[PDB]
Write a protein that binds this ligand. Structure first.
Ligand code: 1FG
Ligand code: 1FG
Lengths: 416, 556
């Protein structure tokens, strides 16, 4: 009820970020949403004396019929003080990713009950644009902790810890993690009763709220114990063409950067001569040995692979065709913290961008669970194409950082 | 006395760490001083300014300027220093509406808010920063000191505060009269509606009445202007719009100045006149900074210019936007990385037009450019109409499907239909996914000496066919492409090519149909003639046979 003092990092001003164009329907939704928020005291109209701006848009959450307001606080979040005051930080729970089932709740509405520091409110300024600039953009700022702001969970953490307090006591085995507006609840329990337990949690937030949140009943069911990774695998053939062998040697040469003892020589020696690509080459016993030794090597994990919290997580994505995507997560090249693959994008087929966008969201979710933060993406898409379409497919309350890959990587084949 | 509501004051601050301006007052002529004193005296009576004590340390220079052929004076305050020290404001005036997004209105009235401007008070604590001094006659008395009580003309914050104040006043009136629309531009208000002129004039009077509650005045006797309106470089008529007339000069010689007015005129006209091309005229500015220089006009640009004037031969108009109808966009390929488009609702009536130009780069293809142009048009349409148009594109459905399924990058274009107006965008070649049975296999390599720039390129094949060619003034990358070129040159309609070049493969995997590299363009021309091409990559120096052999052959 009394504000916690909040400031920007030294030497940097508040965000000034251009609002990007919005469709008519997203504009109407925001006008409708912001009008109510204004009546609830959550936001207030602002004057020209506030130069600051942060982009806003509207989305529809998974399995929902109604618009939600999403603010992109990425610029503000970079510029806001790290709140290390009470705690350096939570050590990220390692047990969350080892849980059979993890459920993701939107608790974000809980933030709206806590007022925002008066001096800091101007930095939350955002603009509802008008079609064809026919009317002035409608300018608001936040009076309370905004969703998507890095300071919101940090500040509200006090209240949150007391609310969950009775809960961890009778359920000490449950791992609970908070990231932004999301609450991640893991357990090793069977699903049916796990689901009901989740329902129990929702009731806690209700009773405290009235002393009704638009998004709270939803949940996102995950199974991190069941997430599959991708060791390097080599073909097993009775018949090897010259082409087959060239690709193998190519794949082994690439893996050799990652794995120390990979040998291509006895395999390379089969390539002796100038031969038709489709000609079948019998494997020599030297070659079969070398191929077999390489398999053993590839079965072991990479050596000297560790996570450094002081460094960025980098996620790379390859489009493999037929709705299949591959990705790797690493801080350092050739040391992968995680690799994975996705064939399942839901009703997304004819749209590559929609598939990519969903892929990015899943990879970020997994990254939030494992390390407690978001990776920086390298996207196999032209900037202008991505920047045009991604807001149309975006279902998450947070947003990661991304860069674009303009040169097709050779390595896409090796993850194929 | 009828009590009037005060206009809410906007709090203003100087930039952090900065103080107000202190600037010397210029000496003025005796005749000038008399003028300024007269002006300031009435301005003081009106409440616009106030005399101040000696304690205000701040000063801003004041000038008097002579309007031509005449006796009469205008007062000018130079706020350049105060503006440097004034905080940033939100500028709502960024985007202007585009006529193509405006709606037909049966009636439109224009109101002059000039007098309403000075009823907008300036923040009390900020007034001291506006202090200025009228020099005394012969400097024999202390100069007269004034400060502003209202938004000074020429100050950084005046326009944004003014418009934001006006907007806040207008809000309830607009909200309770949804059947009219109001837009504010500078000193004017544009109030349109579809009401009959009688009911419309009523609502205007109601509006004049509403502004009166804040004491605000709109001129009674109608301004003498009637459609067309000249606004922001446009002509606005009740049923149609276009740009203000574009006249392309006749000139014996063209400088860089000549062409820049010309590119501006052309770019400006391109939003309405279909098929304008600026590339060649823009081409003459490449890496050339001398402004007075006269550049000889290529014949290729002459044809372009003549093509333009023929399009400019007669006036063309756009219509306004009808929300009840669909928005259509059609694209044409003009050649040389140029693209042109029309956006329309009904056939042969354009809302607007435009062009798109290829981004600078080493290699490209028409499908990527078409895709880019679609994104641009998509974005421009969201801005203007708040929605994505349906596209009419000169590319076959099957072509697009083949392209995006095999392209390494994720790509998408929104709802679109094929229109058959040549030239059609197509795929010129597609490489095979698997090696070709029965096709000859060419192992290629190239190498160069970094010092002597001497190199070699060639191939050896499974049929014992071989070539190696000596090269001068070349590089490793160049020799690697030449090798591939030779294999294409010397093979049949179906061929398998093996290379160790990561450079070459990176180029080919980008599927360029045209390049800045003459060598890449020759390779493309060869690819087009092939029935089937399979390109395989191997790592170099791994003792890969026939690759090893040709590597040795080219490194000698
Ligand atoms: C024909 N057309 C435009 C027009 O006459 N003017 C009149 C003056 C120039 C101008 C500048 C911006 C917007 C409209 C106009 C009618 C019209 N159409 C509109 O959609 C509109 C929306 C808000 C306010 C006035 C408006 N007027
Ligand atoms: C050329 N490349 C793929 C490719 O870029 N394709 C092949 C698939 C379709 C296509 C269409 C237009 C342009 C290029 C392409 C085939 C290939 N075949 C290989 O055996 C190979 C072995 C090692 C490393 C890379 C390789 N690449």
């Amino acid at each position: 009820i009394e504000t916690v003092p909040v400031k920007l990092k030294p030497g940097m001003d508040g965000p000034k970020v251009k609002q990007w164009p919005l469709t008519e329907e997203k504009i109407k939704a925001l006008v409708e949403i912001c009008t109510e928020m204004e009546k609830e005291g959550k936001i207030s109209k602002i004057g020209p004396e506030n130069p600051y701006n942060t982009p806003v848009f509207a989305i529809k959450k998974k399995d929902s019929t109604k618009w939600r307001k999403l603010v992109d606080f990425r610029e503000l979040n970079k510029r806001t003080q790290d709140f290390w005051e009470v705690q350096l930080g939570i050590p990220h729970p390692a047990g969350l990713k080892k849980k059979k089932s993890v459920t993701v709740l939107d608790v974000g509405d809980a933030y709206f009950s806590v007022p925002l520091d008066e001096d800091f409110r101007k930095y939350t300024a955002f603009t509802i644009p008008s079609i064809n600039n026919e009317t002035p953009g409608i300018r608001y700022q936040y009076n309370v902790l905004p969703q998507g702001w890095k300071g919101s969970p940090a500040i509200f953490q006090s209240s949150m810890t007391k609310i969950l307090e009775p809960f961890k006591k009778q359920n000490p085995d449950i791992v609970i993690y908070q990231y932004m507006d999301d609450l991640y609840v893991g357990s090793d329990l069977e699903i049916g009763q796990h689901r009901t337990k989740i329902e129990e949690l929702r009731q806690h937030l209700l009773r405290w709220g009235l002393t009704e949140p638009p998004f709270l009943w939803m949940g996102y069911e995950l199974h991190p114990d069941k997430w599959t990774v991708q060791p390097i695998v080599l073909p097993e053939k009775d018949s090897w063409t010259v082409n087959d062998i060239q690709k193998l040697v190519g794949k082994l040469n690439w893996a050799s950067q990652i794995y120390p003892g990979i040998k291509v020589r006895q395999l390379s020696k089969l390539l002796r001569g100038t031969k038709a690509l489709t000609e079948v080459i019998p494997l020599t016993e030297e070659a079969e040995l070398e191929l077999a030794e390489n398999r053993e090597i590839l079965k072991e994990p990479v050596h000297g692979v560790y996570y450094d919290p002081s460094k960025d997580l980098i996620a790379e994505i390859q489009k493999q065709g037929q709705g299949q995507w591959t990705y790797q997560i690493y801080q350092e090249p050739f040391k992968n913290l995680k690799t994975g693959k996705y064939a399942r994008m839901r009703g997304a087929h004819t749209n590559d961008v929609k598939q990519l966008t969903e892929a990015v969201q899943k990879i970020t979710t997994e990254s939030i669970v494992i390390w407690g933060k978001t990776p920086k993406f390298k996207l196999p898409i032209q900037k202008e194409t991505w920047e045009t379409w991604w807001t149309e497919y975006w279902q998450a309350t947070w947003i990661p950082e991304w860069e674009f890959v303009n040169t097709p990587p050779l390595v896409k084949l090796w993850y194929q | 006395m009828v009590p009037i509501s005060p206009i809410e004051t906007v709090p203003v601050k100087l930039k952090p760490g900065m103080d107000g301006p202190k600037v010397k007052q210029w000496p003025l002529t005796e005749e000038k001083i008399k003028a300024l004193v007269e002006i300031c005296t009435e301005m003081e009576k009106e409440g616009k300014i106030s005399k101040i004590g000696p304690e205000n340390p701040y000063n801003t220079p004041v000038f008097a300027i002579k309007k031509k052929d005449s006796t009469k004076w205008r007062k000018l305050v130079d706020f350049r220093e105060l503006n440097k020290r004034t905080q940033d404001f939100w500028e709502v005036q960024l985007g202007i509406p585009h006529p193509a997004g405006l709606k037909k209105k049966k009636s439109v009235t224009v109101l002059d808010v000039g007098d309403a401007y000075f009823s907008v008070p300036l923040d009390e604590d900020f007034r001291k920063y506006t202090a200025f001094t009228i020099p005394s006659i012969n400097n024999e008395t202390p100069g007269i000191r004034y400060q502003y009580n209202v938004l000074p003309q020429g100050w950084k914050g005046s326009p944004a505060i003014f418009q934001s104040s006006m907007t806040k006043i207008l809000e309830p009136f607009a909200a309770q009269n949804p059947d009219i629309v109001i837009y504010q531009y500078m000193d004017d208000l544009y109030v349109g509606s579809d009401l009959e002129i009688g009911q419309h004039r009523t609502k205007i009077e109601e509006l004049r009445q509403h502004l009166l509650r804040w004491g605000l005045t709109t001129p009674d006797k109608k301004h003498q202007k009637e459609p067309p309106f000249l606004w922001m470089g446009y002509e606005l008529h009740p049923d149609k719009w276009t740009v203000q007339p574009i006249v392309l000069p006749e000139k014996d010689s063209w400088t860089v100045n000549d062409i820049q007015k010309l590119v501006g005129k052309l770019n400006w006209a391109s939003q309405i006149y279909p098929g304008i091309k600026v590339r060649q005229l823009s081409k003459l500015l490449r890496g050339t900074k001398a402004l007075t220089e006269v550049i000889p006009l290529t014949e290729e640009a002459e044809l372009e210019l003549a093509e333009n004037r023929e399009i400019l031969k007669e006036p063309v108009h756009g219509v306004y936007y009808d929300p009840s109808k669909d928005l259509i966009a059609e694209i044409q390929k003009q050649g040389q990385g140029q693209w042109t488009y029309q956006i329309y609702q009904e056939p042969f009536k354009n809302l607007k037009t435009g062009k798109y130009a290829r981004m600078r780069g080493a290699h490209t293809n028409d499908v990527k450019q078409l895709t880019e142009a679609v994104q641009k048009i998509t974005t421009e349409s969201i801005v203007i109409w708040g929605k994505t148009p349906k596209f009419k594109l000169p590319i076959q459905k099957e072509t697009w499907e083949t392209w995006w399924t095999e392209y390494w990058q994720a790509t998408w274009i929104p709802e679109w239909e094929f229109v058959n107006t040549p030239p059609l965008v197509k795929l010129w070649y597609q490489l095979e996914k698997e090696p070709i049975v029965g096709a000859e296999t060419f192992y290629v390599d190239g190498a160069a000496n970094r010092e002597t720039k001497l190199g070699k390129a060639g191939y050896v094949t499974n049929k014992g066919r071989q070539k190696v060619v000596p090269l001068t003034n070349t590089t490793n990358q160049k020799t690697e492409l030449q090798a591939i070129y030779l294999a294409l040159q010397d093979s049949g309609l179906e061929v398998n090519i093996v290379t160790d070049s990561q450079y070459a493969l990176g180029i080919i995997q980008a599927q360029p149909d045209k390049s800045e590299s003459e060598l890449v363009n020759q390779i493309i021309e060869q690819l087009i003639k092939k029935e089937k091409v399979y390109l395989a990559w191997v790592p170099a120096h791994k003792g890969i046979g026939g690759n090893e052999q040709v590597d040795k052959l080219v490194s000698a």
